[PDB]
Write a protein that binds this ligand. Structure first.
Ligand code: IVC
Ligand code: IVC
Ligand code: CL
Ligand code: CL
Ligand code: CL
Ligand code: CL
Ligand code: NI
Lengths: 184, 184
């Protein structure tokens, strides 16, 4: 219900961009009037804030919640990569893309909160790289270098991947997992 | 003399973005009137075109021209990664960012000309991944997945790396090379 307003405004802000869209174009795209929409939402910046928070809820529901308890740290990184790739290459890519593109559009207060949620994921990856090196499950590497290589590989996917293409997202996930986390 | 206009305008277009930077603004950052600037550049999108080609020229002079003849295909990928990482982390970080952020700004022949130079790099990486797989120098992997994992790791650096930080760019290059192209 109320999520339908976020998920529809995410489509416009994504294809057309944040600046290109106004609160009026989103009211039209909804069954509400320019007045009705402003009753559910404070302003435009807070609408963007709600979209990004919704995107992190989906990320944590489909990725972090499901892998953060995996005992073996490299098995935890492999699973995290698969879940994160599948999130990027399917329907919820709308809210994920807005988080990356519109990162700089937020105000100071709201960017601090969203980034706090992003930083928990980065710290999750770094900890897993650290544990995996100590236990001899991956070739040693600085945890920060490993985390941002992980994220660079995965999140770059939305720039080139086409679902009608030669390979499925599942085949891509297998390739990246085996290349960054091979048997060791 | 002419690079001054491109370097200066790239700083603006990089910080303020393409839209939000006008010919009037650039004509001021450079000590000129609006017309004196037009004496050496056609229009705004031509300025963007020249900036992107300048950035691809720098990339080819510092990266591709120096590594494309390396015989061993995995040694070729390692060197290519090192050179590309150092390009992302140093004085020419402005032009490369514009090539990525403004990738969809151009259209027509100019767009196609830039995208052809970009596609030449991807195809270079894909060919080297293929050769290294057949020759048993890297763990087998689809060349397209290897190429865009390469590019994701390397180009994502502009979003987090700070030169005043804990690690140097050379240390980051060492870690990334060891992860993607270890002894095999
Ligand atoms: C110095 C440095 C900044 C130089 C550069 O800019 S290098 C390129 C950096 N930018 C990127 O990597 C962003 C993603 N890459 C691209 O968009 C392309 O490589 C560009 C050369 C920019 C051209 O864009 P575009 O015409 O839209 O290309 P496409 O969207 O058609 O696809 C690009 C390649 O990905 C492939 N692809 C897409 N989906 C799949 C799939 N499901 N399975 C297997 N392959 C797939 C697609 O076939 C294409 O590879 P090619 O076969 O054309 O070599
Ligand atoms: C659904 C999914 C997409 C969820 C996500 O969004 S995951 C994150 C995706 N975005 C990115 O990866 C972009 C790059 N990452 C970041 O910018 C940060 O992780 C963010 C949390 C997003 C923003 O944090 P922010 O407050 O802006 O801090 P910075 O922008 O300055 O990022 C610098 C952090 O990376 C590290 N770093 C930077 N330079 C170096 C260096 N020379 N040597 C070693 N480490 C370095 C450094 O650790 C820093 O993090 P801190 O230790 O300062 O907390
Ligand atoms: Cl899984
Ligand atoms: Cl799982
Ligand atoms: Cl970000
Ligand atoms: Cl691009
Ligand atoms: Ni799973």
């Amino acid at each position: 219900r109320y999520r339908a307003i976020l998920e529809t405004a995410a489509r416009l802000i994504c294809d057309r961009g944040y600046e290109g869209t106004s609160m009026q174009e989103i009211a039209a795209a909804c069954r509400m009037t320019k007045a009705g929409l402003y009753h559910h939402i404070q302003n435009k910046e807070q609408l963007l804030f709600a979209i990004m928070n919704y995107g992190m809820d989906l990320f944590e529901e489909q990725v972090l919640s499901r892998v953060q308890d995996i005992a073996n740290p490299v098995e935890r990184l492999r699973a995290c990569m698969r879940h994160n790739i599948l999130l990027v290459t399917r329907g919820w890519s709308k809210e994920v893309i807005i988080i990356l593109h519109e990162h700089a559009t937020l105000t100071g207060e709201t960017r601090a909160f969203i980034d706090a949620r992003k930083k928990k994921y980065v710290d999750f990856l770094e900890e897993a790289f650290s544990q995996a090196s100590q236990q001899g499950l991956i070739r040693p590497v600085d945890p920060t270098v490993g985390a941002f290589s992980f994220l660079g590989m995965v999140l770059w996917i939305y720039k080139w991947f086409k679902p009608d293409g030669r390979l499925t997202d599942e085949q891509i996930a297998d390739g990246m997992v085996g290349m960054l986390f091979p048997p060791f």
